[PDB]
Symmetry: D2
Subunit: 276 residues, 4 copies
């Protein structure tokens, strides 16, 4: 009755037969967690939910993160209201792993679909575990143990189509407050111990132990490699979908093909520890 149906060999699974708007049992919570450990990104369909519920469900998997930036519902502040009619989304022209420019990148996130365009707006996910596993032996050896700079500043969109309000000052603010830092290039999953590539085009600027030119060659290699179809899935949203993914060993990509159409999601972020 609780059911896990894999979307592909590399990553992703749909879950059915457990109502996450209610309090879930420890057997359920565990099975879900094992699922997440295995398939890295998890989808539940036909699972309508509210902030309180969303917050409670997410909390069962890590301590939640209530933040200043972005929208927050009036009742629960630990659920962001991402709304097209308001905010903007030019932060996703490239593959991302979330907040890798933090010492302490999020463990993952739980995201519910509220209002969707007729179509468009897919999200892709890629597995750092599958992608790594597929590199040549010599290359896994060279990379495992190297480190990489992740830097918020790489997120700078500014005037591409010039949506940015005179307040590009929020952006400047976040910059001055989050200095570049480093994470392993090959990461070991804190819980499963499985190894994943942990560089993403969103924030990774440099492999520290290689020279600029080598770094640039290698990252160009690794960005294209990590995001090949073999290591990714593509989700077409439906309303009342819930996506639950492990941000420690995946990237994702929001396809921008639906503007000006309105899109409303609710996100709950689960705090993560130190990548190693």
């Amino acid at each position: 009755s609780l059911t896990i149906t894999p979307l592909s060999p590399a990553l992703g699974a749909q879950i059915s037969g457990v109502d996450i708007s209610r309090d879930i049992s420890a057997e359920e919570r565990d099975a879900i967690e094992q699922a997440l450990l295995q398939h890295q990104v998890l989808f539940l369909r036909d699972q309508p939910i509210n902030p309180e519920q969303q917050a409670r469900f997410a909390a069962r998997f890590g301590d939640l993160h209530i933040h200043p930036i972005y929208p927050n519902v009036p009742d629960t502040p630990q659920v962001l209201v991402l709304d097209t009619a308001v905010t903007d989304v030019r932060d996703n022209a490239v593959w991302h792993t979330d907040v890798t420019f933090l010492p302490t990148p999020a463990l993952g996130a739980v995201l519910s679909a509220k209002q969707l365009p007729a179509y468009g707006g897919d999200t892709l996910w890629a597995s750092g575990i599958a992608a790594f596993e597929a590199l040549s032996a010599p290359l896994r050896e060279m990379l495992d143990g190297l480190t990489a700079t992740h830097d918020f500043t790489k997120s700078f969109p500014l005037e591409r189509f010039g949506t940015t309000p005179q307040d590009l000052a929020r952006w400047e603010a976040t910059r001055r407050n989050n200095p570049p830092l480093s994470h392993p290039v090959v990461r070991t999953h804190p819980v499963s111990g499985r190894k994943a590539l942990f560089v993403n085009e969103g924030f990774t600027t440099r492999i520290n132990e290689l020279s600029e030119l080598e770094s640039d060659a290698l990252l160009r290699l690794l960005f294209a490699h990590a995001t090949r179809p073999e290591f990714s899935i593509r989700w077409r949203w439906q309303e009342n979908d819930v996506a639950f993914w492990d941000n420690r060993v995946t990237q994702h990509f929001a396809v921008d093909d639906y503007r000006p159409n309105r899109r409303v999601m609710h996100r709950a972020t689960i705090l993560g520890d130190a990548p190693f």
Copy 2:
């Protein structure tokens, strides 16, 4: 009642409310035809057909191709049987457009899913139309009028046919029969008039009017550009699925992650005219 449900803005639509295991009505045929010209790749689920039903259907959209060299159904040799027990699948391991090395590459294909692995073996399509429209104007202006060389051997080197001196002669004949030839880089669809990128990593070796070095840069750019998520869809197959796509303005990619699991598809191929 025949419904057409867009799968993504760039391309793709799912069709239902039509029974293609029988002979379809002028009206239906027409709506599908339009749907093809609009959405470029079409899908039907739960639409089991035998070789003959599949041939009757495909023939409603152009002349068929009886290839008398691969494993086809003896009774209706218009339908080719692609079984992983018997035949292999090396061909779809890279983004390609079907047989562009022919002066008259295939118009399109009808594909029917027999037996499948639980999951894995997705196929991706990409729109030459949407990719082209997405290039900036100066790049469109330069490429529109350039030609490119397509070469059968690029996807089928000597190593493909085998080691035997028998496979060698076989192969050297096929090559003698298909010298490298040229097509427009930007193809005008002969029915819709919509312009499309018409290079593919599977067979395009060279942009003719550019230097090797310039060509290499441009094709590496175009290949990446044209297979971006914004220009593609990804189909997860189920038994009795049917895919019908226009091979004049698309590309496709068969994810290789099911081996050794067995996979059987029936394909009928509709003959095309000279790209311009």
Copy 3:
């Protein structure tokens, strides 16, 4: 006056004249005509002092008096580079001088005062030869496009900031020099010759292309424009004079002599707006 070509693509050595003293109106014209043809001119065994250097450089254009570096007192018109005083982390990438300016230097006169035994070659490349070697369709696309030149490509300080004492001058030049644009294909204001006018040092973006398209084209242009066919390489020797047109060339200072020391005087000649 003798003029002796060094490569089909660019560069010529000069002799039969002495430039430590004013030159005839015929000699100067002959030189300007050499500079316009050969793009970079060299003079061996031509000892000179800031005063004469200035006098010579000035007969080819208006001279510059800053330029964010240590200069000789008697002649503010002559910059003194000394690897003991001033490092050179900005010369070992191909660049065209001050393209981040609204109006980059016409070119410079450079004198060899003190040099290591060997090492520290300087390479020069021609945007005229480079451009003419591109295919017709590619010249047609590029000709008319523009590119962003950003002072902070050839620096970012090695991210030496946070450090404040010596870096405040960096964010100053940065604030004083926002990224601006130049045509990708420049028409030489005298000769009418067309040249590639992008350089890896400062050029960050082709404005009219997307970022991915720009990135591809720039990788291609940066490699193409510095192939052997379009460049020359000068082994320096004390008392040398290099005089180059910075409107249609790039140059590269090989960094292979550290920790050896090296001293040279520059007169930069002010330029006009690229088109």
Copy 4:
């Protein structure tokens, strides 16, 4: 015997020994040592005839003889390279000589006879200097890997001709020199210095990497190994002699002089199996 280094990476001008003579064991030893340090050696104003050039080249190994090429009648040990008789191309990609062979040439001795007034420079690049400049993680990964070298990378089918007598000579050479492998990091058989041993001319694949990875890596190595820091550019004059070590270098013939006549004489010294 005087050895004047041209750059820290490689290259030295030699004098105090007339190599058109029968030289001493001692002078021959000093030359070999200079070659082992500098990788490429140059003599100016060294007229030499084919008999002498061979007698000199043989002092450093066995020599390659005659066919099916244009050697001087009495001297099958010296190849005569004339533009008037034989057209030359794709010496215009960077390459190491005959790396597709099991035992690529040790090196060559090259004499300049008749030169264009200018153009026709040759660049050399040090694979030792270039290896040492790679980051440790890269050196550690590359050192032990092997790569495929393939005659047909630079001599594709179309360089022979649609003529049936050309496809018989090329299929046989393609069958006579099928692709094979050398170490990516070569250990000089005499000095033990380690060097990158790939080159754009012949190297197709890093075997223990995937195609995709090989592609990105070779593209890095090719650009890197030919940077200005690890190369020199020789401007030829008549009666120059260049003598290079093909075990650890790459070279490039700028093609910018045609249709002007260039006549060179080359003796090739036979090499052994790279490890």
